[PDB]
């Protein structure tokens, strides 16, 4: 008290080329309280060989942590951002936009 | 004009047996420290992390961190009873200190209870938020009244410890935190905003420091639909931005993205769309 829900934004390093090394970014920020499971995702899994952020927090108080992986692209491949935290019911997956990225003003 | 050095800790208590502590050390929004609580040392993240603050010293405060990180801890774990209603529960704290091209520094110490603003020390006091009512009044007066001397240091380090080490880590750090870095742009489409109309989005990313102005053109025309998004982190301190424009079916051809930067000078990045379209 107060809970507040995080805010998931995805997007790429590098233009989105098949078969060119790349750097996929998952940041997320707003939320409260810390305690929080993020995941990034190839084809469902978790992506086991990350990068984070240490841990910190805005003006606010809220906490934000920035997420990152090389990664290289294929036609095939389907890559996301899994987050749960108390404040969602289930945990929410956003879905790698190659073109647009997947971001939330 | 004005940058900051900020500790920030984060204490997590998950139940009256368990608790987490971590916390870092920021130059404005550059992460120049880390704490290996598996050992209780500092991490130094850049070759000059240490400014010029000699080994002896750092030596000193890594020995009150350890120090700090557990009795605060315990004391807390000690305070809060049985409980197990206001279990789980998180305590901010951001001390730290700000230099400012005209005026002397400040220094601040906050603390917050479950996200809300609980107290803050002033220069000698500490001083409950209105906006957080008895446990605030509670905590501050133990805090003035038993832990006086811990007051003394923490004064001693907000106010005098914190500017002379960020003085000297700006000047350590000095050909890196002044890096102009150049970025690159790329075009895509996006999702569709209605029928017979077109997305078309401008990529920007790479640059430093964070300052950039991007609009859609045509030829010399600077488009009215351009949108600009928020400015997003990337590792190893750069960031990225993306700039998108709704355009009627059969007009994207002649459409360009124009991206002015400081590291750029006169020498403005211009892309030309396509197609995908
Ligand atoms: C934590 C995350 C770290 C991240 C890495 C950071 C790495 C980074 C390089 C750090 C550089 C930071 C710059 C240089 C400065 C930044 C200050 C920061 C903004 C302010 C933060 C103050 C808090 C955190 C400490 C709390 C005080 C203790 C709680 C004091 C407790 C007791 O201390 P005390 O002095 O009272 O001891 C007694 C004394 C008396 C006589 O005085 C004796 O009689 C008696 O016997 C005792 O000895
Ligand atoms: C020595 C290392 C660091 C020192 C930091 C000082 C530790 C201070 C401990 C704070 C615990 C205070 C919580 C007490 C809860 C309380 O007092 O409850 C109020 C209600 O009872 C009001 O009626
Ligand atoms: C407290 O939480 C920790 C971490 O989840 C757990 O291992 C431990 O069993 C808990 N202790 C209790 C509930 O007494
Ligand atoms: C339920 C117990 C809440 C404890 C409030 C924490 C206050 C910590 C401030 C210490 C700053 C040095």
Same mark, same amino acid.
């Given at each position: 008290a107060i809970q507040r829900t995080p805010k998931i934004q995805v997007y790429s390093?590098?233009?989105?080329?098949?078969?060119k090394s790349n750097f996929l970014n998952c940041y997320v920020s707003?939320?409260?309280?810390?305690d929080i499971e993020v995941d990034l995702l190839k084809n469902g899994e978790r992506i086991e060989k990350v990068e984070h952020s240490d841990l910190s927090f805005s003006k606010d108080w809220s906490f934000y942590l920035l997420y990152y992986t090389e990664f290289t692209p294929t036609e095939k491949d389907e890559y996301a951002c899994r987050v749960n935290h108390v404040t969602l019911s289930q945990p929410k997956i956003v879905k790698w936009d190659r073109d647009m990225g997947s971001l939330v003003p | 004009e004005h940058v900051s050095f900020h500790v920030i800790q984060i204490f997590s208590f998950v139940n009256q047996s368990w608790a987490r502590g971590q916390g870092s050390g920021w130059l404005d929004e550059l992460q120049t420290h880390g704490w290996d609580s598996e050992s209780g040392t500092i991490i130094?993240?850049?070759?000059?992390?240490?400014?010029?603050?000699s080994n002896e010293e750092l030596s000193d405060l890594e020995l009150l961190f350890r120090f700090y990180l557990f009795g605060l801890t315990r004391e807390i774990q000690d305070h809060a009873?049985?409980?197990?209603?206001? =279990? &789980?529960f998180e305590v901010q704290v951001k001390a730290g200190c700000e230099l400012h091209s005209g005026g002397s520094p400040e220094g601040f110490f906050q603390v917050a209870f479950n996200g809300l603003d609980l107290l803050s020390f002033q220069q000698t006091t500490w001083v409950p938020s209105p906006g957080c009512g008895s446990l605030a009044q509670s905590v501050c007066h133990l805090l003035n009244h038993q832990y006086e001397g811990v007051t003394e240091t923490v004064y001693n380090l907000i106010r005098s410890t914190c500017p002379r080490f960020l003085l000297g880590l700006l000047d350590a750090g000095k050909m890196y935190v002044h890096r102009q870095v150049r970025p690159e742009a790329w075009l895509s489409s996006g999702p569709s905003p209605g029928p017979g109309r077109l997305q078309l989005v401008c990529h920007v990313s790479?640059? =430093? &420091?964070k300052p950039v102005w991007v609009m859609w053109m045509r030829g010399e025309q600077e488009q009215q639909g351009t949108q600009l998004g928020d400015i997003l982190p990337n590792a190893n301190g750069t960031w990225y931005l993306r700039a998108t424009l709704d355009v009627a079916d059969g007009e994207a051809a002649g459409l360009s993205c124009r991206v002015k930067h400081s590291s750029l000078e006169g020498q403005d990045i211009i892309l030309y769309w396509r197609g995908s379209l």
């Open positions: 390093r590098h233009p989105a080329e098949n078969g707003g939320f409260h309280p810390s | 130094f993240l850049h070759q000059w992390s240490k400014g010029q603050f009873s049985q409980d197990y209603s206001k =279990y &789980p790479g640059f =430093y &420091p």
